[PDB]
Amino acid sequence: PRPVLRSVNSREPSQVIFCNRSPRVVLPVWLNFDGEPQPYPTLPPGTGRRIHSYRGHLWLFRDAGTHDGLLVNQTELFVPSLNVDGQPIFANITLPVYTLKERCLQVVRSLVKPENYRRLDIVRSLYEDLEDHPNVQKDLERLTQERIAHQ
């Protein structure tokens, strides 16, 4: 019973360059062969880095401190393919266009400790929004669901 989202063990090397084109510290996350996310060394903003990965491995990318979602070549997941004529493959990591609400939640979260969320004078519903922190595990479940609907 293997997850839909997982790397395949191709053993076929693929040279990749993670390029952080965001203002965040990026955490690369590798989905292992059982679909479990594994962290890899982070990238400061504006820096890039050579990676030895493999064909059909799966990667996603997050803000290292907050796990806010990031995009890679404009999508959620990145899969190395075989290198054509020595040329490495680029993973260009960017900010998505967050909604104004989610962006405000990021800023409030960065300024307020969770024990104090409910000591802010805002509508009651926003407490649960603030508490609904980004989470890799919930993202994978949502992406799996979305993919199955395409079938």
Partner: peptide, 14 residues
Amino acid sequence: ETLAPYIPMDGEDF
């Protein structure tokens, strides 16, 4: 046997 990704130590992260 399984082969996971790795970062070469001598890779000058640019």
